[PDB]
């Protein structure tokens with residue numbers, strides 16, 4: 001069971017609606033396993049750095065890239 | 067048009083409430099009960115009112131909301147209904163489907179019950195307002211409606227979904243009537259052309275009951291920004 005297989009299993013563990021993408025709300029549940037302003041910074045942060053096409057989602061490719 | 071999902075103006079399961087009983091980014095009030103797979107905005111008890119509004123205003127020229135919900139009761143007739151809002155101020159409490167009156171923006175009202183006795187309910191009714199109109203509870207918004215359709219959103223096998231789009235000054239409501247599990251099976255309900263609403267506003271959802279009462283459950287409110 002490789003590192004990447006675990007990145008992937010992790011990714012789809014948080015894809016609760018099964019659309020193969022991670023939206024801000026999905027990420028927020030990972031980021032809390034704190035104030036809302038702390039939470040917003042982190043998420044906004046992730047999306048700025050990692051969401052290339054700027055659609056509010058990060059796909060497995062974009063996820064891995066981090 | 068390119069759509070961006072806006073988490074900060076959105077909520078959904080399966081981890082909807084956090085442990086202090088709050089919905090991230092949204093304020094709830096009245097009788098609303100947030101569980102984790104949904105918010106029961108108004109449960110099937112007499113004379114309930116509850117609501118859920120975004121904490122901050124959204125400043126999107128064009129947008130879409132995908133709201134998924136159930137309205138459920140023991141009878142073939144229920145009350146009062148459920149409202150989806152975009153409005154200049156939060157309307158946490160009041161007599162209009164549980165939210166405030168004389169609002170400035172638009173409310174999309176899912177009106178379960180036929181107060182005007184025209185046998186034309188349940189119905190979906192678009193109502194604009196400039197901060198000076200009282201919603202006419204007793205006429206089901208009839209003379210104030212910009213547009214409307216009849217659609218029985220109650221007691222359906224699968225959740226109902228409203229897609230509400232404001233693009234290029236026209237407001238379209240599409241409804242998936244919940245007869246099937248296909249979540250993209252939308253049908254046209256209503257449209258208002260050349261409609262002008264505030265450039266910034268809160269998104270909201272509210273519901274209420276009277277002497278009759280359904281549970282009004284909202285599973286998710288997903289907000290998208292358009293271009």
Ligand SMILES: [Ca+2]
Pocket residue numbers: 014015016017018019020021022023026
């Ligand atoms: Ca997802």
Ligand SMILES: [Ca+2]
Pocket residue numbers: 051052053054055056057058059062
């Ligand atoms: Ca993306």
Ligand SMILES: [Ca+2]
Pocket residue numbers: 146177178179180181203206
């Ligand atoms: Ca009514």
Ligand SMILES: [Ca+2]
Pocket residue numbers: 179180181182183184185186187205206
């Ligand atoms: Ca009516």
Ligand SMILES: [Cl-]
Pocket residue numbers: 025026029078079080081082
């Ligand atoms: Cl969630």
